[PDB]
């Protein structure tokens, strides 16, 4: 049922991200979080994070900075609440996919937001592995930004790399 | 005749797995199970499990999560109904082949489904050997996932290894 | 000599496909068929099918629906008359190449025509392998159409897949 | 709040640039600078530079030479005060966008003003990269001016290129 | 030196094409031909054909039918005298560029003249490739003429296509 | 120090290639040559050839035929003066990279210049291996030119291949 | 000396195979044959067959069907003229290496040509061993073609296997 | 404790090698050296050399020439200070692994740097065995470079082989 | 001292065989011969033949046909000059070891060269025992070649067996 419920949520949230309906994106992502919460399985976490990813990618394509921010905050919270390394790794992969799409589209706000959430996951996780993976996310985004000629995103990635390297 | 019958079933089920026709995959796999049931030989069990494997591998290549799930449930049932250790070992090898193909293709759902069936075979078998073989399946899938850079599958394999090690 | 003769035919037919000269495309493709007929070798069949492919690809690029249709009918007839599995497989590869080029160009008529000939080759061949290969052609065309954002072609491929799956 | 504050500033400054209200454009741009100053974040710098860009682009469309000058001086000061390479790069992109719009509109004063600020950013930055980027700005403006038949702007770009090449 | 000599010729011929000075265009193009003749290199042929192209394009923009005709006759002669396939291909590209500019400008005489020279290059070359390339020139000119709503040029291109297809 | 010196030279030469400053490109490339000369190491040769490559690639992107010519003459001289096979191979790779970039950009002059230097390296080297590598350069440039639809470059590559094959 | 002579021949023939120079490939391979003829040793036969192999492999990589055909005809003639089983076995190994490279490259003509020469060696040799080895060549080529997904080559290998099995 | 200390060093140094932070890579590698120094065991030497290897491999993958150089200098110093043949052999294996990774990645600087350190280990060791092993390193790198088509690295390996063979 | 001298020679010759340095292999093997000559003992002959064997084995592993040939010629000369049956038997064992290693490595040239030297030792020795031992060498090489699937070497061994059997 959760899959079908998450399907409803995904549909509504994606359409809201396409239209600039921040209120509806916020409400639907909160429901994805609650479904993951209520289900108590990694499979539900995975599905919810996939919904969050799809919403954020659509938002990144549209210049919908609010929806990217809302979605990645919910990925961060799913990573906080799940209590597993797998959820943290999956959240970082969501952040990477969103940031890469943003870099391709000239969406500098979404690159900034995504990389800040990568930094926050590394800061809160307190594992060496999460720091390493966050640096790998930053490198992937830098590579894409160089390829696309997105100088703002190259600079943002360098800034976040420096911050992780100084503060981790 | 069974071979030719299983040949028909294989053809139809593989084509259904390629097209996302969950209803037809389900029906055809049920018929493979029934043929193994009616034949009453290990050779028929072997052939049916090979059909199941081929269907699940094709599904794993295509992102057809439903068909992978349906196929591996039928492998599990063939392992339950056959009453031989050989059938259990063959079912575990099917699960390994499917999970390895899934790991190569980035099919994280199919890796999860396959490893869960490995865990269920170990849980239901109540033999030390089945636990050992299931752990060997998990290791093979982990190795492949590391080789392919499929971090989701590495994490899933670690999770299932931990579960078998805690609960077996 | 046949190669040089097929060279003449190719030149004239391609130029006719570029110009919307249906009458000349028809006449030249009939001569390619007759050369394959007169030669009585697989090498001549291969060469004639390559000529047919080149003509149909050029037609697909130009929106020349008549020439795509004429060319693929001649591929079908070469597959009917040759009496070999190799000719049938080569004809299906011609159909795939044409349909893929059409999908890339927004040529929905040519996608429809090509996939209908794939279906007819599967229907007339009466082999399991031809059905499997035709389904593989449909999948390749679907993949390309998704990649290019050609929703008409995605839908056409789904329709033909369904038909093969129901009627084969 | 800053975003909303910068929103107010943007609204007032753009309307002032449309009306030839130099005094109000000056006052509002000073407030954008002060908001960036008070906030102490790169995100605030980015937002303030976007406001400056929008004001200068509107001014360039209207023949409002004073407002283009005022706006680009504030971009220069934001680049001076921020203490980051990212702010310098963003300021140069503002200058490029304004100069390109000016070239399209026959606004030779705004092209001159913009390219002079590019030159000043390169002169003050003391980095090779800023010189390279400034030359890239000049090239982009030259390209646009050639495309639009704006011979004054082509000549101005050549003059500034020569100056950077002699003096850098 | 030839480059500088061809530079002088280009300057004088372009200015003559702008002013309707048929006598001077004729004399200067004859000198470009003679320079290519005297130099005995492909590089000189390339440069002379570029001069011819620039003169003919300027003429096509101005309604200077005489100068387009004179220039394309000299391209034809350079293609005749050079003894290389490369010169023939370059001459056909000159003809295409001139015909495309003419189609954009409503210069129906220049389209006719250019396409007739394409036809003559195909007729005199006696290679299949030159016929194919000439047909490609006609298609490019047809495409441009359709885009610009130049019905005379669409009709002329169709006429020349038909002639090449009947007589080649 | 040489690296930093070559860094200065690179910066100045690239900027000169972007601006059409033939005199400065010439002077800076002469200094790269002299640095390689003074250093007396293969590492210095490698670095100087990399500078030459970067300058020529930038020139090829800009239509700066003079700078491509100047740069490749200096690569040729570095290959002449170094006295090693490694320097000759590196010079040929520079020529290939420049010619490939030129083919992608429609820069037919730069393709011609580059392939002529490949031919001169093969002519002067008097080794079979240099002839083979030069032919491989021509093939790579032909492949790229076919891919990009740069018929002038395809023809030029064929001409140079023929010359090497006749005269080597 | 022969080695050095065969070295010259190899160099010229390989370069000709890379360039589509059928006339030169033909002439050089005839000279390899004549050197083997004049030398009267198995070592010279071995060296000549190695030259032939290298030429045919390069041709197979390039789509040079003429050169593959010419080269394998010369291997066949060396097998005919040498009067030893060793020469026949070496010729069959040449054919296998060429056909395998062709299968890897999608060069269906070269697979066909190579397998036809395997068939002709088996037909002319009149030994059981040559038939067995030819069938082993066909199997090796089939295996490679299956591995690479070269369905044309799989079908061609099956056809030739059938022919050897029916007619040997 | 040393293992955990070397773990910290490894983490920081690898992340620094990924980011182009030469200063931090230098500092961390100096600490690995000092830990090996302070510990006074072969096990500590082995662990430190493994850290150095991991850092240099990551650097070689990233184009971080400075970090490869710094790391291999520290391997050389560990080989100098340890006073055992085992440390020298382990240092040479580090150099080989780094050079092989560099050859695979097109990192010609890192191949050069690595092979120069192999040469220096052979020069300083004054044992026949170290010369033999260094030649084996060069051969392994040559083999890999040939396999990957890295002609620069093949040439560099040949140069270093020649130098060892002349000067050892 | 001779042992140490032969040690130097071995080191230099092996390294030369690894690098393709035919001139140095030739010179060093000549010195091994001269040491055996100067020493006048069977122990020196044994040591020199062991050096020759090691050099030839290394060459056979590397595809260094020249060095295998040079080394086995020196074994032949040591067998000619020593004046003892023991030296002849030891030379034949060297030839066998080299040919066996070559058979394992696919080094058909080295198998041919080695077996030809076995034949020459049998031809020059004029003893029945040397013929018998040479036939035993050929059998050992045939056995190894069959085991490794080296059909060229099997055929070469059969040829040499036939020659010894006809001509001995």
PDB file of N, CA, C and O in Angstrom, chain G residues 10-37:
ATOM      1  N   UNK G  10      55.396  -5.416 -45.351  1.00  0.00           N
ATOM      2  CA  UNK G  10      54.419  -5.265 -44.266  1.00  0.00           C
ATOM      3  C   UNK G  10      54.055  -3.801 -44.040  1.00  0.00           C
ATOM      4  O   UNK G  10      52.864  -3.445 -43.945  1.00  0.00           O
ATOM      5  N   UNK G  11      55.092  -2.969 -43.919  1.00  0.00           N
ATOM      6  CA  UNK G  11      54.889  -1.537 -43.693  1.00  0.00           C
ATOM      7  C   UNK G  11      53.991  -0.918 -44.763  1.00  0.00           C
ATOM      8  O   UNK G  11      52.947  -0.280 -44.471  1.00  0.00           O
ATOM      9  N   UNK G  12      54.381  -1.151 -46.015  1.00  0.00           N
ATOM     10  CA  UNK G  12      53.616  -0.591 -47.136  1.00  0.00           C
ATOM     11  C   UNK G  12      52.183  -1.138 -47.223  1.00  0.00           C
ATOM     12  O   UNK G  12      51.217  -0.391 -47.463  1.00  0.00           O
ATOM     13  N   UNK G  13      52.041  -2.443 -47.024  1.00  0.00           N
ATOM     14  CA  UNK G  13      50.722  -3.069 -47.110  1.00  0.00           C
ATOM     15  C   UNK G  13      49.775  -2.640 -45.973  1.00  0.00           C
ATOM     16  O   UNK G  13      48.573  -2.446 -46.195  1.00  0.00           O
ATOM     17  N   UNK G  14      50.296  -2.523 -44.758  1.00  0.00           N
ATOM     18  CA  UNK G  14      49.487  -2.091 -43.635  1.00  0.00           C
ATOM     19  C   UNK G  14      49.017  -0.663 -43.847  1.00  0.00           C
ATOM     20  O   UNK G  14      47.814  -0.332 -43.659  1.00  0.00           O
ATOM     21  N   UNK G  15      49.961   0.192 -44.260  1.00  0.00           N
ATOM     22  CA  UNK G  15      49.566   1.567 -44.511  1.00  0.00           C
ATOM     23  C   UNK G  15      48.507   1.622 -45.632  1.00  0.00           C
ATOM     24  O   UNK G  15      47.516   2.354 -45.524  1.00  0.00           O
ATOM     25  N   UNK G  16      48.683   0.825 -46.675  1.00  0.00           N
ATOM     26  CA  UNK G  16      47.676   0.741 -47.747  1.00  0.00           C
ATOM     27  C   UNK G  16      46.314   0.218 -47.250  1.00  0.00           C
ATOM     28  O   UNK G  16      45.242   0.697 -47.665  1.00  0.00           O
ATOM     29  N   UNK G  17      46.332  -0.747 -46.354  1.00  0.00           N
ATOM     30  CA  UNK G  17      45.077  -1.246 -45.787  1.00  0.00           C
ATOM     31  C   UNK G  17      44.377  -0.176 -44.939  1.00  0.00           C
ATOM     32  O   UNK G  17      43.140  -0.104 -44.922  1.00  0.00           O
ATOM     33  N   UNK G  18      45.156   0.653 -44.243  1.00  0.00           N
ATOM     34  CA  UNK G  18      44.574   1.756 -43.464  1.00  0.00           C
ATOM     35  C   UNK G  18      43.896   2.828 -44.333  1.00  0.00           C
ATOM     36  O   UNK G  18      42.953   3.495 -43.882  1.00  0.00           O
ATOM     37  N   UNK G  19      44.397   3.016 -45.553  1.00  0.00           N
ATOM     38  CA  UNK G  19      43.954   4.090 -46.466  1.00  0.00           C
ATOM     39  C   UNK G  19      42.957   3.693 -47.566  1.00  0.00           C
ATOM     40  O   UNK G  19      42.652   4.518 -48.428  1.00  0.00           O
ATOM     41  N   UNK G  20      42.605   2.421 -47.674  1.00  0.00           N
ATOM     42  CA  UNK G  20      41.698   1.992 -48.727  1.00  0.00           C
ATOM     43  C   UNK G  20      42.372   1.903 -50.095  1.00  0.00           C
ATOM     44  O   UNK G  20      41.703   1.923 -51.122  1.00  0.00           O
ATOM     45  N   UNK G  21      43.671   1.641 -50.095  1.00  0.00           N
ATOM     46  CA  UNK G  21      44.458   1.576 -51.335  1.00  0.00           C
ATOM     47  C   UNK G  21      44.580   0.121 -51.751  1.00  0.00           C
ATOM     48  O   UNK G  21      45.590  -0.549 -51.535  1.00  0.00           O
ATOM     49  N   UNK G  22      43.513  -0.342 -52.396  1.00  0.00           N
ATOM     50  CA  UNK G  22      43.393  -1.743 -52.769  1.00  0.00           C
ATOM     51  C   UNK G  22      44.513  -2.164 -53.725  1.00  0.00           C
ATOM     52  O   UNK G  22      45.100  -3.231 -53.561  1.00  0.00           O
ATOM     53  N   UNK G  23      44.826  -1.282 -54.674  1.00  0.00           N
ATOM     54  CA  UNK G  23      45.853  -1.612 -55.665  1.00  0.00           C
ATOM     55  C   UNK G  23      47.211  -1.897 -55.000  1.00  0.00           C
ATOM     56  O   UNK G  23      47.932  -2.840 -55.378  1.00  0.00           O
ATOM     57  N   UNK G  24      47.595  -1.045 -54.054  1.00  0.00           N
ATOM     58  CA  UNK G  24      48.867  -1.206 -53.355  1.00  0.00           C
ATOM     59  C   UNK G  24      48.849  -2.414 -52.416  1.00  0.00           C
ATOM     60  O   UNK G  24      49.829  -3.164 -52.360  1.00  0.00           O
ATOM     61  N   UNK G  25      47.741  -2.642 -51.704  1.00  0.00           N
ATOM     62  CA  UNK G  25      47.648  -3.855 -50.865  1.00  0.00           C
ATOM     63  C   UNK G  25      47.841  -5.107 -51.710  1.00  0.00           C
ATOM     64  O   UNK G  25      48.624  -6.000 -51.341  1.00  0.00           O
ATOM     65  N   UNK G  26      47.158  -5.151 -52.864  1.00  0.00           N
ATOM     66  CA  UNK G  26      47.286  -6.280 -53.791  1.00  0.00           C
ATOM     67  C   UNK G  26      48.739  -6.493 -54.241  1.00  0.00           C
ATOM     68  O   UNK G  26      49.293  -7.613 -54.155  1.00  0.00           O
ATOM     69  N   UNK G  27      49.364  -5.414 -54.706  1.00  0.00           N
ATOM     70  CA  UNK G  27      50.753  -5.533 -55.158  1.00  0.00           C
ATOM     71  C   UNK G  27      51.716  -6.016 -54.049  1.00  0.00           C
ATOM     72  O   UNK G  27      52.542  -6.943 -54.261  1.00  0.00           O
ATOM     73  N   UNK G  28      51.605  -5.423 -52.851  1.00  0.00           N
ATOM     74  CA  UNK G  28      52.496  -5.786 -51.746  1.00  0.00           C
ATOM     75  C   UNK G  28      52.266  -7.241 -51.281  1.00  0.00           C
ATOM     76  O   UNK G  28      53.223  -7.989 -51.030  1.00  0.00           O
ATOM     77  N   UNK G  29      51.008  -7.664 -51.206  1.00  0.00           N
ATOM     78  CA  UNK G  29      50.762  -9.062 -50.802  1.00  0.00           C
ATOM     79  C   UNK G  29      51.315 -10.046 -51.850  1.00  0.00           C
ATOM     80  O   UNK G  29      51.842 -11.120 -51.499  1.00  0.00           O
ATOM     81  N   UNK G  30      51.228  -9.673 -53.135  1.00  0.00           N
ATOM     82  CA  UNK G  30      51.827 -10.512 -54.177  1.00  0.00           C
ATOM     83  C   UNK G  30      53.324 -10.621 -53.947  1.00  0.00           C
ATOM     84  O   UNK G  30      53.920 -11.703 -54.139  1.00  0.00           O
ATOM     85  N   UNK G  31      53.946  -9.522 -53.522  1.00  0.00           N
ATOM     86  CA  UNK G  31      55.383  -9.617 -53.230  1.00  0.00           C
ATOM     87  C   UNK G  31      55.700 -10.467 -52.010  1.00  0.00           C
ATOM     88  O   UNK G  31      56.686 -11.226 -52.021  1.00  0.00           O
ATOM     89  N   UNK G  32      54.857 -10.426 -50.976  1.00  0.00           N
ATOM     90  CA  UNK G  32      55.061 -11.344 -49.849  1.00  0.00           C
ATOM     91  C   UNK G  32      55.003 -12.795 -50.322  1.00  0.00           C
ATOM     92  O   UNK G  32      55.834 -13.648 -49.916  1.00  0.00           O
ATOM     93  N   UNK G  33      54.034 -13.080 -51.190  1.00  0.00           N
ATOM     94  CA  UNK G  33      53.927 -14.436 -51.731  1.00  0.00           C
ATOM     95  C   UNK G  33      55.186 -14.822 -52.485  1.00  0.00           C
ATOM     96  O   UNK G  33      55.737 -15.932 -52.298  1.00  0.00           O
ATOM     97  N   UNK G  34      55.657 -13.903 -53.320  1.00  0.00           N
ATOM     98  CA  UNK G  34      56.854 -14.196 -54.098  1.00  0.00           C
ATOM     99  C   UNK G  34      58.102 -14.377 -53.244  1.00  0.00           C
ATOM    100  O   UNK G  34      58.974 -15.195 -53.580  1.00  0.00           O
ATOM    101  N   UNK G  35      58.234 -13.602 -52.174  1.00  0.00           N
ATOM    102  CA  UNK G  35      59.344 -13.808 -51.256  1.00  0.00           C
ATOM    103  C   UNK G  35      59.291 -15.203 -50.630  1.00  0.00           C
ATOM    104  O   UNK G  35      60.339 -15.910 -50.565  1.00  0.00           O
ATOM    105  N   UNK G  36      58.096 -15.610 -50.180  1.00  0.00           N
ATOM    106  CA  UNK G  36      57.972 -16.968 -49.624  1.00  0.00           C
ATOM    107  C   UNK G  36      58.375 -17.989 -50.694  1.00  0.00           C
ATOM    108  O   UNK G  36      59.113 -18.948 -50.416  1.00  0.00           O
ATOM    109  N   UNK G  37      57.913 -17.768 -51.918  1.00  0.00           N
ATOM    110  CA  UNK G  37      58.249 -18.639 -53.044  1.00  0.00           C
ATOM    111  C   UNK G  37      59.751 -18.727 -53.289  1.00  0.00           C
ATOM    112  O   UNK G  37      60.328 -19.836 -53.397  1.00  0.00           O
TER     113      UNK G  37
END
